[PDB]
């Protein structure tokens, strides 16, 4: 979903699972 993410570049990276490492929980 990566809406949780609350940067731009890290959010704006449409790499969610990608994402995830380091906007877990
Ligand atoms: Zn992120």
Redesign the pocket.
């Known amino acids: 979903r990566?809406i949780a993410?609350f940067?731009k570049v890290?959010?704006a990276?449409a790499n969610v699972a990608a994402?995830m490492t380091?906007?877990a929980k």
């Open positions: 990566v993410c940067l890290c959010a990276a994402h380091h906007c």
